[PDB]
Amino acid sequence: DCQEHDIETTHGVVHVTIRGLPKGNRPVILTYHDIGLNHKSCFNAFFNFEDMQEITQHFAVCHVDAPGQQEGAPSFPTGYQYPTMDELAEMLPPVLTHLSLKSIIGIGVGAGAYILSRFALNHPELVEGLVLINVDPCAKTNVVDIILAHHFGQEELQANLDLIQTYRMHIAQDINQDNLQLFLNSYNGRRDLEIERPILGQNDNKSKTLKCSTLLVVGDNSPAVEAVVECNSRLNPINTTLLKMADCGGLPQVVQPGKLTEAFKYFLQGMGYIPSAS
Amino acid sequence: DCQEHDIETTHGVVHVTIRGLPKGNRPVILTYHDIGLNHKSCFNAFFNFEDMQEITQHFAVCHVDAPGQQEGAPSFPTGYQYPTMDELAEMLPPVLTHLSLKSIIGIGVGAGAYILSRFALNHPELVEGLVLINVDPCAKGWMDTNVVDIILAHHFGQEELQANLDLIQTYRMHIAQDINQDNLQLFLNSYNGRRDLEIERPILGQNDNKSKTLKCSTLLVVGDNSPAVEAVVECNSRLNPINTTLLKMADCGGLPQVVQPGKLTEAFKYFLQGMGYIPSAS
């Protein structure tokens, strides 16, 4: 059923986790986490949710842990040349090639969102759709207090509820505090996606945009509300949908997995997959 | 769902592969494999069987890979002190500890079987039951070309082996390619040098000079055409018939988990049923 691979790229190694088994005329669900998380902390709560298993049975689910961000990853040396956000997306075709994966339905959060997008623009042939959670297509004391600051809204983060401290502990303990610095640094070094909404008559600016179907997701109480909204205005509305989730801030995948599973289903039905929908 | 771990022991690292998540009370099914195999080669065919998924979903399955037997394991150095079978069995307690596992239900093949049994004698509090496939409790007595040819003989009966069926060739290629040929020899060496299990059937009249025997429920499994049959039968004779059962699988030889898995799943169900697990049959 499952298998974990350590795949050799030209930008070093990337640790993946295949769950389920795919068919040759059916795609794979590739996942990519945000800064401070891994495939387990980021997605597994959402992915092991009851409503998802009905979906996931039909499509094999592959979870990509970023370089040094996989659990039990050794510390990267001090002067290691950590792959840049753009380079990370350069490492994604090999992952598909290694596992003879013809195409994916991407699911990414924040940095994972950006990296899946870059990849989708670089290789739109290999990407069929994108769920882009809390995506920011523009550029930007304690590293842990910085990532929780990116993840959750001040009210929510200040309130330090069970979620806040739970994931505060994950970041702290689960993820390499050396490799996490280099992955944060990388994300922080990200350039503008430089995607503009197309015009039917004629384009005022010759800017490429996502050809594949896109579901943008952001909590009302998310700090990424403006950034996901910018992105939407810069994306082809014929292929894009914007979901603003109520009573939700950081990690809407875990905060509201019920609401998000329903949308992913509606989204997937739209492409032609899970037509029966139980 | 699944997770791999490279677990530090005092006898070095041991590779393991956890699928599902277990609670405190219910025990986590533990596998240990034979020489020239790994958890993948040995168990995943059997474990991924239809009828098993019904049982295995309900229990967690920690697949242990032997030192330097896990896929993509680097060659050990020339003079590397490779853990003895007893030392291999001492690596198990730290694994339960590392994964906050309370107890296990062991499944072992060949070396796998012996290692779990040494563990079960060391720590009866940790084992609730054992299924032992093609186990040999007695010392080899063959101290001395190609480990692969050696290993094939070990796993498959001469009559079976003479035919050269798809399984003999399939597993002949697996032993060659799957395993680092440096580390295999050492694991083969380590298994061959094994000592007598020192089990003796008790007598009900009076204590049999404080005889030492397994205290957990046991199911010994062997194919009719297996070369291990009289070793397993000896083992059985040396064990408590009250807490033991011997399963002779008809029209079957080496690797019964791979061959006739439906039958073994059914047997393995009844085994689990005896413990008080799986109240209703699937």
Author numbering:
A (entry chain A): 29 to 168, 183 to 320
B (entry chain B): 29 to 172, 183 to 320
Quote what the paper states about this structure.
The N-Myc downstream-regulated gene (NDRG) family is a member of the α/β-hydrolase superfamily and is repressed by Myc expression. Although NDRG3 has a high structural similarity to the α/β-hydrolase family, the substitution of the residues of the enzymatic catalytic triad and narrow folded cavity due to the presence of helix α7 and helix α10 indicate that NDRG3 is a nonenzymatic α/β-hydrolase fold protein.
To determine the effect of the residues in forming helix, we constructed a helical wheel model using the helix α6 sequence. The helix α6 model of NDRG3 is amphipathic where the electrostatic surface appears to be analogous to that of NDRG2. Comparing helical propensities of each residue on helix α6 between NDRG3 and NDRG2, Ile171 and Ser176 of NDRG3 overlap with Met165 and His170 of NDRG2, respectively. Based on the helical wheel model, we designed NDRG3 I171M/S176H and C30S/I171M/S176H mutants, which mimicked the helix α6 sequences of NDRG2, and determined the crystal structure of the I171M/S176H mutant at 3.3 Å resolution. The structure of I171M/S176H mutant did not exhibit a clear electron density map in helix α6 region, likewise to that of NDRG3 ΔNC WT.
